[PDB]
Amino acid sequence: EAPNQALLRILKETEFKKIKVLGSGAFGTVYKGLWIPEGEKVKIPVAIKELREATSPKANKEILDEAYVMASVDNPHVCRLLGICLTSTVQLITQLMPFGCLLDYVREHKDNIGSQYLLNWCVQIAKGMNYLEDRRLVHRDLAARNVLVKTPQHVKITDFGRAKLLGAEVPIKWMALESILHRIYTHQSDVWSYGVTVWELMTFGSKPYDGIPASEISSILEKGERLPQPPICTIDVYMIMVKCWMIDADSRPKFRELIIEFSKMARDPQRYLVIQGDERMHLPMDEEDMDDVVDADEYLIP
Ligand SMILES: COc1cc2ncnc(Nc3ccc(F)c(Cl)c3)c2cc1OCCCN1CCOCC1
Numbered sequence: 001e002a003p004n005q006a007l008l009r010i011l012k013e014t015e016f017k018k019i020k021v022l023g024s025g026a027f028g029t030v031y032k033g034l035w036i037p038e039g040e041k042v043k044i045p046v047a048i049k050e051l052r053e054a055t056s057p058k059a060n061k062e063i064l065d066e067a068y069v070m071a072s073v074d075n076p077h078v079c080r081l082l083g084i085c086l087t088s089t090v091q092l093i094t095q096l097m098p099f100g101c102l103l104d105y106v107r108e109h110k111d112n113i114g115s116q117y118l119l120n121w122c123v124q125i126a127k128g129m130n131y132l133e134d135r136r137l138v139h140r141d142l143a144a145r146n147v148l149v150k151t152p153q154h155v156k157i158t159d160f161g162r163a164k165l166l167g168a169e170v171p172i173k174w175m176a177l178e179s180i181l182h183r184i185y186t187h188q189s190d191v192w193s194y195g196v197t198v199w200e201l202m203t204f205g206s207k208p209y210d211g212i213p214a215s216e217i218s219s220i221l222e223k224g225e226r227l228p229q230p231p232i233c234t235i236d237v238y239m240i241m242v243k244c245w246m247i248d249a250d251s252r253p254k255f256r257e258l259i260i261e262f263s264k265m266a267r268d269p270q271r272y273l274v275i276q277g278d279e280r281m282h283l284p285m286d287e288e289d290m291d292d293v294v295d296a297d298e299y300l301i302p
């Protein structure tokens, strides 16, 4: 393995400004904020992740692993760590993803999301994932809930809580069978969860195996049962979902294949997804001083 020269950047608590809350519950408490690097005359919209108030040592070992992973990734369809703040408790800082989690976003906008968007998202996520594969990370927690929306046209994979290097050492409904039965995890098991992620999108945010309790899942999945074909889905699109769910993990698509297929499909989006009222579908920030606002994507350091 090659040296990981990712630069971990530590940031003074005084570099943040306005800080409203966005997410609570579980370990979570995620805030919206503003980060003004040094004397640099840029304001950077940021999200800030604490693993609760109670700074109990167990939590910090988990959050620091996350930081290590997020600090190591560099690609447009994957969220990067801007740095950390060593306050009383540990804070992760990352580019604010203004439109939130993709899951909530599809739920929130069923009526105005069209085929081009859905297919483009699939393309972008297959890219994020192929990027991780190159850097040999197994994400282990791909789901619509862990995909964030920079703009309706730009999605990025986040939440590296469970990311690991291939061959190292619990959301059941997104997990490949080998993972549920043997804790085997591979790029190919990520593809399984990719399958499920796609299904969440094609159903505008349904819950996978709604009603069935997580303990039964591997039983069902052995019987040969899979998620049903979503209404908007041609067999072409659904057959791709289904291949993500083969028992033989090597018989599953590669993320590189997924990019190509979804890409082809996104050139003629009405031939693959049937959405009522499709074509006529158009989708789309809080301070007077916005002169100096720079997206993190345009904020680079040598
Ligand atoms: C405007 O909304 C967000 C922007 C975000 N921008 C960047 N990152 C977010 N989350 C996040 C995820 C993992 C991380 F390590 C860090 Cl540092 C941040 C963000 C989370 C955001 O909302 C968190 C999700 C809010 N919902 C609330 C309802 O239930 C699902 C989650």
Ligand SMILES: [Cl-]
Pocket: 170, 171, 172, 173, 174, 214
């Ligand atoms: Cl679950």
